[PDB]
Design a protein around this nucleic acid. Structure first.
Ligand SMILES: [K+]
Lengths: 120, 53, 327
RNA sequence: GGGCCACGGAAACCGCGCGCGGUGAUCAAUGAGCCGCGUUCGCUCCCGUGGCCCACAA
RNA sequence: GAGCGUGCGGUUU
C-alpha cells in the first residue's frame, strides 16, 4: 500500500474515523478536500486529519503526514476516498478531511488520537 | 482522465487491473505541478524518507 | 511497433589501431555535475495543464538556466515525453524535432460500431495522410502529407477506443481521429492524448516528472546529494542515439571543433548504411558528441578511400579546448 | 575569402487556457462559481555585427 | 526576414 501511509490501521479504528466525521459534520465543523484540509493544518485549526489510503497520484496527499507532524496534529487513514466523501456529506470522493470542531464526537476523537499515538 | 497503465507491465489500459501482468493500474498522467509549489518542502520530507536519504 | 529511428546499425572499423588519450575530453559519465548540466537534456514527463513553453520557463527559473529549448510542442492538456535540451546542448533539438513520435490516444466515437469494424478501418490509415494544420497552430496552415507508421488498438470499451499510433513529425492527431470518425460514418473526437516517444526519448527510467526534477535539484543544491539530479539529466549524446555515427581519431577532433570538414583519414569507425546527404553525428572514441554533419560519402566509400571530405561539418557542440590542436 | 562559434533580427499591454492566494459548491473536494494576482520554448535557413580557426588528422 | 515543431489568438507602436 502507498508510501504516504505511515502505519497500519485496524478496521475497527478505521470505522471509528468514518463515524467521527459523520457526527462532527452536522454537530460541529469539518473541512473536506485536500486544499481545505491542508489550510486547516497550516492554520492550526485541525483537531484530527483523516487521509484516504487509495489516493492516486500519491502527491495529492503525500505532504500531509509530514505537515501534520510539523504542526503537532494527529492524522489517521481510511481505506476508501469515495466512502470518506460520503462521510463528509458530499456525493463525490474526498482524498482528505479535517475536523475543526468535533461537536458531539469529542471523546471519540480523543480516543482515536491516543491509539494512533502508539502507532506513530 | 481515463488512461491508466500497469506499473509492472507498462501496458496502457482503461481497466483497474492489468490485462497482461495482473497488477493494479495507476493513472497514466503525472500529477499537476505549480511553479509556486507550496508544499515542495513537506513533499521533499516525505520523499527523503522514501529514498533512504 | 517500428519507427525509422529503430533500424539496426552495424558499426564498421576503419582504423583498428586508433586509441584515445584519457587526459583529453570529458566522456559523459566523468563530467563534473555543472558541465553535465551545460551539455544536458531532460526527458520530461509533461503534466496536463500548462503549455510546453510555460513548463520550460519554469524549468529555466527553478534550475537557474540562461537557456533551454523543448522539442515538438505538446498541447496544454497532453502529457508525456517532452525532451528539454539545456544551455549549450539546446541546439541538439534539431536531431529530435524531425524524428518520429508515438502517442497513446483515447478516441470517443459518437455512435456504436462493432469492434471488428473499428480495427479494420483504423488499419487502413497506416501510410500517407493528407492534412491541413488546425486553427491552433504554430505553423503555416497549408495542405501537407505525413506518414502514420503504425496504429495499434489496445482496448475498445463501447464507444471508447484506446490506441497507440506512430507518426512522422508534424502529424496532427486530432485531425486523424476526426477522419477515422468520418470513415466509420458515426464521427469521433479525441478525449485524451499522451506522447510515449520522441525519437530516442522513451518511457524508461530516464523519464522524469517536474516534481522529481525540482526535488532532485534541491537534494543537490540544498542537501549536497549529486546522485539523483545527475540521473535526472541525460548527456546530449542521448539526443543523438537514433542517428548514424562516425567515430573519429583524437587528432581530428579539435580541427572539427574549429569548423574543419571531416576527411576520411580522421575516421576510426562508422555505422554501416550511411548514404550521401544523410544527417550524421560525429563522435569521439570516448563516445562524446563532437558535431552534427552531412554525409558527403556512403559508408563503403568512407571505408574504401584514403583521402577526400567524408562529412560536411555543420553544427559543433564540443568546446574548442577539450582536445589539443594536433594539426 | 571560407568554415565554425556567439550576439541581434522588436517592445509594451490584451484575451483564451493554465496556475497561486482567498472563499468553498443541489454527483469537477484530484476543486464549481466568484474576487485578486501571476503566466508562453526553442530550432533551421537567411541577413547584420563581432570572435576563433583554415586543420586530409600527421 | 522565410520556415519548422500537436497551442496559441488580439490591440497599439
Ligand atoms: K504531432
Amino acid at each position: 500500500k502507498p508510501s504516504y501511509v505511515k502505519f497500519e490501521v485496524p478496521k475497527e479504528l478505521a470505522e471509528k474515523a468514518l463515524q467521527a466525521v459523520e457526527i462532527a459534520r452536522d454537530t460541529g465543523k469539518i473541512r473536506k478536500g485536500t486544499n481545505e484540509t491542508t489550510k486547516a493544518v497550516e492554520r492550526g485549526q485541525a483537531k484530527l486529519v483523516i487521509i484516504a489510503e487509495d489516493v492516486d497520484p500519491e502527491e495529492i496527499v503525500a505532504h500531509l503526514p509530514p505537515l501534520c507532524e510539523e504542526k503537532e496534529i494527529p492524522y489517521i487513514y481510511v481505506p476508501s476516498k469515495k466512502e470518506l466523501g460520503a462521510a463528509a456529506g458530499i456525493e463525490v470522493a474526498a482524498a482528505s478531511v479535517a475536523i475543526i470542531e468535533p461537536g458531539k464526537a469529542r471523546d471519540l476523537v480523543e480516543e482515536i488520537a491516543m491509539k494512533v499515538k502508539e502507532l506513530m | 482522465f481515463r488512461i491508466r497503465k500497469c506499473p509492472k507491465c507498462g501496458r496502457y489500459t482503461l481497466k483497474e487491473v492489468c490485462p497482461v501482468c495482473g497488477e493494479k493500474t495507476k493513472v497514466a498522467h503525472p500529477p499537476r505541478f505549480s511553479p509556486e509549489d507550496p508544499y515542495g518542502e513537506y513533499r521533499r520530507r516525505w520523499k527523503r524518507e522514501v529514498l533512504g536519504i | 511497433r517500428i519507427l525509422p529511428a529503430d533500424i539496426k546499425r552495424e558499426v564498421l572499423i576503419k582504423d583498428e589501431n586508433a586509441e584515445t588519450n584519457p587526459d583529453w575530453g570529458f566522456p559523459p559519465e566523468k563530467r563534473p555535475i555543472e558541465m553535465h548540466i551545460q551539455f544536458g537534456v531532460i526527458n520530461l514527463d509533461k503534466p496536463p495543464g500548462p503549455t510546453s513553453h510555460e513548463v520550460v520557463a519554469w524549468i529555466k527559473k527553478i534550475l537557474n538556466l540562461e537557456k533551454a529549448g523543448h522539442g515538438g510542442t505538446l498541447d496544454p492538456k497532453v502529457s508525456g515525453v517532452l525532451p528539454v535540451a539545456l544551455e549549450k546542448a539546446t541546439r541538439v533539438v534539431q536531431a529530435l524535432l524531425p524524428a518520429g513520435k508515438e502517442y497513446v490516444a483515447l478516441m470517443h466515437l459518437h455512435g456504436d460500431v462493432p469492434e471488428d469494424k473499428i480495427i479494420q478501418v483504423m488499419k487502413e490509415f497506416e501510410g500517407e495522410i493528407i492534412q491541413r494544420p488546425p486553427l491552433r497552430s504554430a505553423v503555416k496552415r497549408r495542405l501537407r502529407t505525413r506518414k502514420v507508421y503504425y496504429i495499434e488498438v489496445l482496448e475498445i470499451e463501447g464507444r471508447d477506443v484506446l490506441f497507440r499510433v506512430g507518426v512522422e513529425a508534424g502529424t496532427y492527431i486530432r485531425s486523424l481521429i476526426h477522419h477515422i470518425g468520418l470513415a466509420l460514418g458515426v464521427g469521433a473526437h479525441m478525449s485524451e492524448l499522451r506522447r510515449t516517444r520522441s525519437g530516442p526519448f522513451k518511457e524508461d527510467e530516464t523519464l522524469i516528472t517536474l516534481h522529481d526534477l525540482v526535488d532532485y535539484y534541491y537534494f543537490w543544491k540544498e542537501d549536497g546529494i549529486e546522485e539523483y539530479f545527475r540521473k535526472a539529466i541525460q548527456p546530449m549524446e542521448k539526443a543523438v542515439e537514433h542517428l548514424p555515427k562516425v567515430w573519429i581519431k583524437d587528432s581530428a577532433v579539435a580541427a572539427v571543433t574549429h569548423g574543419a570538414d571531416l576527411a576520411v583519414p580522421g575516421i576510426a569507425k562508422l555505422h554501416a548504411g550511411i548514404k550521401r546527404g544523410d544527417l550524421v553525428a560525429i563522435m569521439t572514441l570516448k563516445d562524446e558528441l563532437v558535431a552534427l554533419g552531412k554525409a558527403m560519402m556512403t559508408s563503403q566509400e568512407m571505408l574504401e578511400k584514403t583521402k577526400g571530405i567524408a562529412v560536411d561539418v555543420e553544427k559543433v557542440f564540443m568546446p574548442r579546448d577539450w582536445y589539443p590542436k594536433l594539426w
